[PDB]
Design a protein around this ligand. Structure first.
Ligand code: E9D
Ligand code: E9D
Lengths: 144, 144, 144, 144, 144, 144
C-alpha cells in the first residue's frame, strides 16, 4: 500500500540509505538552485521530463509544510508545542524529502544515469575504512 | 517558482476553487480508490503516465503528513496544544491535496479532456443562483 | 449613438433583458471564470476571436469602476455619502455589466450559437405555466 | 490580469505614455470625430475591423462615466463633494481615456501602421534638442 | 587596451568630438527612447545585433552610476562635499555615454552607414564659420 | 525597464549569485589578463565575437569610474567625502562588474558552454556541507 518514491527512476530508498544525513544540503539551498536554474522551465506548462512533474510536486509539498510551520508559529501557545512541532518539521520531515529535492534537481542537471552512478560510487567511498578513504569524497560533475 | 501543479494538465487553482469544500470525497476513500483500481501500475517500476508520476508524489506526501499527526498526537503534551494541529491536518492541509488526489484519479479513468469539461460544466452549474439551478449537478463520465 | 454592445454579435439588449435579472451570476463569481479559464488567452498579445477583443475591454472597464469605488471608496470625508454612490456601482451598473461578462464568457465556452439559442430557451421556460413544463430547468453544458 | 488594451494592436501603454500628455485632443472634441466620420460604420450590426469592435466599447464605457457624472452629477446633497469626484472623471480617467479614443479613431483613418510609426516619430521629435530639428512638427495626414 | 568603443563601428572619439555638448538629447530621453521603441528585443534573451549587445552594456552602466548618485546624495554628509559629485555625474560622466546611447540608438533605426554620413556631413556644417553657415543643420534620416 | 546583463549569454544574475563575493579576483588582475591575452584582438575593429563587444564596453566603464575616483581624489576636501566615495567605487561598484570582467574573459578563453557548466558545477560544490566538500574547489580548465 506504500509506494517507493524512487522506484520509478531506477534508484530506491535503500540505495539512498548510503548517503549520510548531513551530506544533504538545506532546503533553502536546493530551492534557490531550482528557482535559479529551472524557474523558467518549472512554471512552463509542459512535460519537459518526469523530474519536472516530480519536482513541481515536491516544491509545493514543502510549500505546504511552511504553511503548517507558520500556522503553528502563531495559533499555538505552549513553547514546547509551538517549537517542538516546528522543530519536527525542519528536523525530520524536512530531511524526509531533502532527498527528493536533492535527487530530482541533481537528476535534471546531470542526467539520471550520472546520479545513479554517483550513488554507487559514493557507496564505495563510504564503505572504505577511514585509513584508506581518499579525503576528497566524490562529487557530481557534468561530462560532455 | 510560486506556481500550482495544474499547469501542464490544463487547469489552475482558481478553476478548482469553484468546487465547494464538501465536493471532494474523503482522504481515506481517495487513497483506497487509488489502490482499489490503480494499484496495478501505481506501485510498479513502470513509468506509464505523467499522471502516475505526479500521483505517486501525492500519496507519499499524505503518508508523510499522517506520520506528523501520529507524532504530534502521541508526543505533544496538551490536547489544547495538539488537537488544534491534528484537526488542522485533517481539515485544512488535508483539503490542500484532498482535491489533488481527486484530480489525477479522475483524470486517469477519464482523461485530461473529460475531467476539464466536467470542471467547466460544473462551475456553470454552481455559479447559477439557487432558484434557477437544476436539482442535479452534472455527472462526470466518459463519452463514447 | 445607440451603440448596442450586442448588435455585432447577433443579439441585443432586449433579449438579455428578456431573461430575469437575478439569473445572472455575480461579478466576483464571474471574473474568476475567465480569470481561471481564459487568463492565458486574454492576456495573449494576439486575439483569438472578437469575443476576446470584446471581453478584454469589459474587464478593464470594470477596473476603474472598482478603482473609482476604491479611490472614492476610501478618499472621501463623508461616509454618509460614500455608500450613497459606491453602492450604485454594484446597484445598477453591475446589472448592466454582469450581463455583459456573462454573455461573452459563455459565448467563448459554448459558441455564439448555443448562447443565442439558450437565451430563447430559458427565457421561454420561465414564462410557461408551471403546471405544464419540464421542471428540470434548461442549462448550458459542454456535454451533449 | 495586466490586460493591456493595446497589446492586441502591436502597441502598449508605455508608447502612448511616451508622448506628452497634453498632445491628445479633448474627449468632447474627439467623440464627434467618430460620431461624424464613423457614426454609420460603428452603429452597423456587422463589424468591419477589430478597431470597430474596440472603439465600439470605449464609447459605451464613456457613457456611464458621463451618466455617473450625471447621476452623481445632479443627485447628491453636498455640492462641496460633488466636484471632488466629478472633476476626477475629467481629471485622471479621461487622461487614460482620451488616449484610448485617439488611438483607434486615428487607427481607422490611417491604419495601424501609420499610427504606430507616428508614435515613434512624434515622440522623438519632441525629445530632440530644439536647436537641431525641423521646427515643422510631424503630423498625420491623408495626403502623402 | 586604451581604445574607444567606436572602432568596429567605423568611428572614433575624435569624430564624435565635433558635436557640441548641447548636441545630444538628455539621458532620460535616450533611456526612454531606448525602451520606447527598442524594448522589444532589448530586454529579451535574443542576441540579434552587435549594436544591441553593446547597447545593453551601456544602459546597465547608467543604472550603475545613478545608483552612485542616489548613494552619495543620501549618505555623504556635506552638500559642498557631495553636490559636486552628484552634479559631476549628471554633467561630465553623464556626457561620457550621454552620446554613447545616442550613437547606437541612432545607428539601429538608420544603420551604421547612414549615421556616419550624418557625422561626416555634420562636421562640414559645423567646421564652417558662422557667417557662411546655412541656418539649418543637416537632418539625420534614411535615404530610400 | 531593467535588462539582465547576462540574459543574452545564457547565464543570469541569479545564476552568478552562486559564486561568493571573495571568489572573484581584483579588477587589476582581470584587466591585466585581457590586456595580456586579448589586447591584440580587443583593439582590432572587428566583431570577433559578442564577448569582445561586451568586453570593450566593460573595460571603458571601469575606465570611467577611475576618472571619477581621481576627480573625487582631488576636487573633494572632507576625508569622509574623498575617501568614503572612492571606497564605495572599489568596494561595491567595483564588485558590481568584476563579474562582467571575470565572466566575459573566462567566456572568451574557455567558451561559453564551459563557463556555464562551471557555474552549475561550482553551485553543487558550494551547496554541499563543509564535512563532505572536497577541499579542492572546482576550477576552470580547457579541454581539447
Ligand atoms: C473515477 O471516478 C470516480 O470515482 C469519481 C467520480 C466519477 N465516477 C464516475 C461517475 N460516477 C457515477 O456514479 C456514474 C454512474 C451513474 N451513471 C449515470 O447516472 C448515467 C448513466 C448512463 C447515462 C446514459 O447513458 O444515458 C446517463 C445520462 C446521460 C448520458 C449521456 C448524455 N448525452 C450527452 C448524450 C445525456 C445523459 O442524460 C442523462 C439525463 C438524466 N436525467 C433525466 C436527469 C439522467 C441520466 C443521464 C447517466 C461517480 C464516479 N465522480 C466523483 C465526484 C466527486 C465530487 C462530486 C461529484 N462527483 N468522484 C469520484 C471519486 C470518488 C471517490 C474516490 F475515492 C475517487 C474518485 Cl475519482
Ligand atoms: C532615431 O532617431 C532619433 O530619434 C534622433 C534623430 C533622428 N531622428 C530622425 C530625424 N529626425 C526628424 O525629426 C526628422 C523628421 C523631419 N523630417 C524632415 O524634416 C524632412 C522630411 C522629408 C524630406 C523630403 O523627403 O524631402 C526632407 C528634405 C529632403 C529629403 C531628401 C533630400 N534628398 C537628398 C533628395 C533632400 C531634402 O531636402 C530638404 C530641404 C529642405 N529645405 C528647403 C531646408 C527641407 C527638407 C528637406 C526633410 C529627428 C529624429 N536625430 C537626433 C539629433 C540629435 C542631435 C542633433 C540633431 N538630431 N536625435 C535623435 C534622438 C533623439 C532623442 C533620443 F532619445 C534618441 C535619439 Cl536616437
Amino acid at each position: 500500500m506504500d509506494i517507493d518514491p524512487y522506484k520509478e527512476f531506477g534508484a530506491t530508498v535503500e540505495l539512498l540509505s548510503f548517503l549520510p544525513s548531513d551530506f544533504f544540503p538545506s532546503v533553502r539551498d536546493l530551492l534557490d538552485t531550482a528557482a535559479a536554474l529551472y524557474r523558467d522551465a518549472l512554471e512552463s506548462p509542459e512535460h519537459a521530463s518526469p523530474h519536472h512533474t516530480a519536482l513541481r510536486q515536491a516544491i509545493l509539498a514543502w510549500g505546504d509544510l511552511m504553511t503548517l510551520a507558520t500556522w503553528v508559529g502563531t495559533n499555538l501557545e505552549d513553547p514546547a508545542s509551538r517549537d517542538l512541532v516546528v522543530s519536527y518539521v525542519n528536523t525530520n520531515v524536512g530531511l524526509k524529502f531533502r532527498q527528493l529535492l536533492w535527487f530530482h534537481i541533481s537528476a535534471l542537471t546531470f542526467g539520471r544515469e550520472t546520479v545513479l552512478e554517483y550513488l554507487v560510487s559514493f557507496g564505495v567511498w563510504i564503505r572504505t575504512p577511514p585509513a584508506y578513504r581518499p579525503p576528497n569524497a566524490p562529487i557530481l560533475s557534468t561530462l560532455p
